[PDB]
Amino acid sequence: MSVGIVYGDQYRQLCCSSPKFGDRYALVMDLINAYKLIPELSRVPPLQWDSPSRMYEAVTAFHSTEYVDALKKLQMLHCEEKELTADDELLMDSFSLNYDCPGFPSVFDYSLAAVQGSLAAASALICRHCEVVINWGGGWHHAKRSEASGFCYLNDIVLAIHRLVSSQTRVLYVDLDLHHGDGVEEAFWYSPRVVTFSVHHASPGFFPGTGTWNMVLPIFLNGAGRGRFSAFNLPLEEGINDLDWSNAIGPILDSLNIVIQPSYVVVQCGADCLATDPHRIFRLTNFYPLSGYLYAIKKILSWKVPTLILGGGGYNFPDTARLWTRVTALTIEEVKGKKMTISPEIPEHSYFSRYGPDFELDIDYFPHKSLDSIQKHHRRILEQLRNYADLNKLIYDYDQVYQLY
C-alpha cells in the first residue's frame, strides 16, 4: 500500500550538482510537490554509512577499489582547481573518466548520492516499509565495474539489485530508457536469479552499440554459464509510437513475470524515449486517458510485486518532470487505490516558467503512426524464455505464455 520516494535537502543539492543533468531533479520533485503528491508518499531517506570503510565496502560490492579511488581523486582534483598531471590524465583515461564522463567538483558525492538513494529504496522494499519506492535521482545503468560510461559513474541499479538478491530471491530488471541497459546486463550476465530486460533504440554508431545482433553471421548473446538465456533485449528502429512500443513490450513483460515469478521488480524509467527528448528517436508521450511508459508501469504494478522505479536518461528537463510526475501519480493510484487528479494546467511553483509557453502537463506533441521486426523479436524472445525456463527447471503454462503474444 505504501509508496516511498527518495528525497532530502543534501540529496537534492547533490542530484542537482552535475553539469549534464543540472537542476532536472529539482524540477521533477517540485512538479510532484506542486501537484500535492508528497503527502501520499513516504520519504525514504538516502542511506548513509558508519565510516568510510563501510561506504567503500558497499560500493566495491560491484565497483573496483582502484576505480572508486580514481573517482574520489577526480573530485579532489576538480575541487583544488589543480590542473591534472599527465600521470593523472592517463589514470582517469584508464577508467573512461573523460569525454562524456568528465570530472567536476562534486563528481564522487553526486555519483554516490544515487547509490545512497537506490540502496535505501531497496532496504525499504526488503523490510516491507513500502510496496513501491521511486528514486528519480537514480537509474545510472551504463556504469561498469571499472569504467564510467554515458554520464554514469557508479551503478546505483547494480548495487540496489545486489542488496535485493542478498536479502530463493529472483529480481526482474526492466530498462525502459532509450539506451541499452548494458551495465546492469553485464553485472548479472552469469546469474539466473537476476533476469535483465532492456527495450531500446539500436542502430549503427548509436550508444552503446549492445542489446542487439553482434559480431563475435551476427549472434544475439543472452547471458552465460548459470545465467545463459537470462539477458533479454528488444532493439527497435527509430520513430516508434506509444501503441507500437506498448504492443512490443507488453507480452514480453507479462511472459517474464509469469515464468520468473520475481520477488522484486526494478524498473529504469529513463525519459529519453519521449517524442520531445532532444535525441528525437522514439515518439513516446506522457498522455493518460496512452503513454507507453504509463502502460508499462501500470502492467508491472498490476503484478503486485515489490517494485523499485528509477530515473535515468531524459534531456528535456520539463518533459522529464511531466512524465515522472504522471508515473508517480499512477504509482499512487495503482498501489494505494487512491485516484490522484492532476490538473492539465501546470500549478504555480518555483519552476513554473520552465513549462512555457503552453504550461500544460501533456508534452507538446501530436502522435501519428510509427511491426514485422517486432514479430521476429517476439518469436526469438518467446524461444529464449523457453530455454531460460528449461535451463532453470521452471514450471509454467507454455500455452498461456504463447497466447500473450
Report in angstroms how near the CB of residue 12 gets to Zn ion at its nearest: 22
Specify the residue, 46 or 311, whose C-beta has the smaller distance to Zn ion: 311
**162, 175, 228, 281, 304 from 193: Cα distances, Å:** 10, 17, 11, 32, 19
Distance of CA 369 to the CA centre of its chain: 27
CA angle 390, 144, 106 (to 5 degrees): 145
Which listed residue (63, 141, 142, 200) is catalytic? 142
Helix (H) or strand (E) holding 171: strand 171-175
Question: 218 exposed, middle or buried (CB, 10 Å; 0-12, 13-18, 19+)?
Answer: exposed
Tell me: is residue 200 an annotated ligand-binding position: no
Q: Which three cell numbers stand for residue 395?
A: 514450471
Applying CB under 5 A, the span of 37-45, 50-58, 102-110, 172-180 interacting with K ion comes to 172-180
Among Zn ion, K ion, none, the one that 320 touches (CB under a kind-dependent 5 to 8 A) is: none
Identify the residue whose cell numbers are 505504501. Answer: 2
Which residue of 149, 230, 316, 384 would you call a contact of K ion, by CB under 5 A? 230
Among K ion, Zn ion, none, the one that 175 touches (CB under a kind-dependent 5 to 8 A) is: K ion
Specify the residue, 254 or 272, whose C-beta has the smaller distance to Zn ion: 272
Which residue of 26, 164, 178, 234 would you call a contact of Zn ion, by CB under 5 A? 178
d(CA 288, CA 340): 12
Among Zn ion, K ion, none, the one that 313 touches (CB under a kind-dependent 5 to 8 A) is: Zn ion
Among K ion, Zn ion, none, the one that 272 touches (CB under a kind-dependent 5 to 8 A) is: Zn ion
Q: Determine if 179 is a binding residue for Zn ion (CB under 5 A).
A: yes
Tell me: is residue 50 an annotated ligand-binding position: no
Q: Determine if 75 is a binding residue for K ion (CB under 5 A).
A: no
Report in angstroms how near the CB of residue 231 gets to K ion at its nearest: 5
**Alpha helices (H) along 234-310:** 242-260, 292-302
DSSP calls for 362-375: S-S-------HHHH
Task: Decide if 142 is catalytic.
Answer: yes
Q: How many residues bind K ion (CB under 5 A)?
A: 10
Report in angstroms how near the CB of residue 344 gets to K ion at its nearest: 29
Which residue of 40, 147, 175, 244 would you call a contact of K ion, by CB under 5 A? 175
Among Zn ion, K ion, none, the one that 230 touches (CB under a kind-dependent 5 to 8 A) is: K ion
Which residue of 8, 46, 183, 313 would you call a contact of Zn ion, by CB under 5 A? 313
Q: Which three cell numbers stand for residue 147?
A: 569504467
d(CA 317, CA 63): 29
Q: Which three cell numbers stand for residue 240?
A: 516508434
Applying CB under 5 A, the span of 46-54, 121-129, 217-225, 308-316 interacting with K ion comes to 217-225
DSSP calls for 34-76: HTT-GGGEEEEPPP--SSHHHHHHHHTTTS-HHHHHHHHHHHH
Report in angstroms how near the CB of residue 312 gets to Zn ion at its nearest: 6
Q: Determine if 177 is a binding residue for Zn ion (CB under 5 A).
A: yes
**Residue 286 in contact with residue 323, Cβ under 8 Å?**
yes
Specify the residue, 103 or 313, whose C-beta has the smaller distance to Zn ion: 313
Applying CB under 5 A, the span of 92-100, 165-173, 313-321, 332-340 interacting with Zn ion comes to 313-321
Interacting positions 249-308 with Zn ion (CB under 5 A): 270, 272
**Residue 310 in contact with residue 135, Cβ under 8 Å?**
yes
Q: Which three cell numbers stand for residue 215?
A: 559480431
Which residue of 46, 227, 251, 292 would you call a contact of K ion, by CB under 5 A? 227
Among Zn ion, K ion, none, the one that 334 touches (CB under a kind-dependent 5 to 8 A) is: none
Tell me: is residue 88 an annotated ligand-binding position: no
Phi/psi at 42 (5° precision): -85, 120
Q: Which three cell numbers stand for residue 274?
A: 519521449
Identify the residue whose cell numbers are 550476465. Answer: 189
d(CA 341, CA 347): 13
Interface residues toward Zn ion, by CB under 5 A: 177-179, 270, 272, 313
Interface residues toward K ion, by CB under 5 A: 175, 177, 188, 191, 194, 198, 200, 223, 227, 230
Please enumerate, by residue number, every residue annotated as part of a binding site for Zn(2+). Answer: 177, 179, 272
Please enumerate, by residue number, every residue annotated as part of a binding site. Answer: 177, 179, 272
What are the catalytic residues? 142
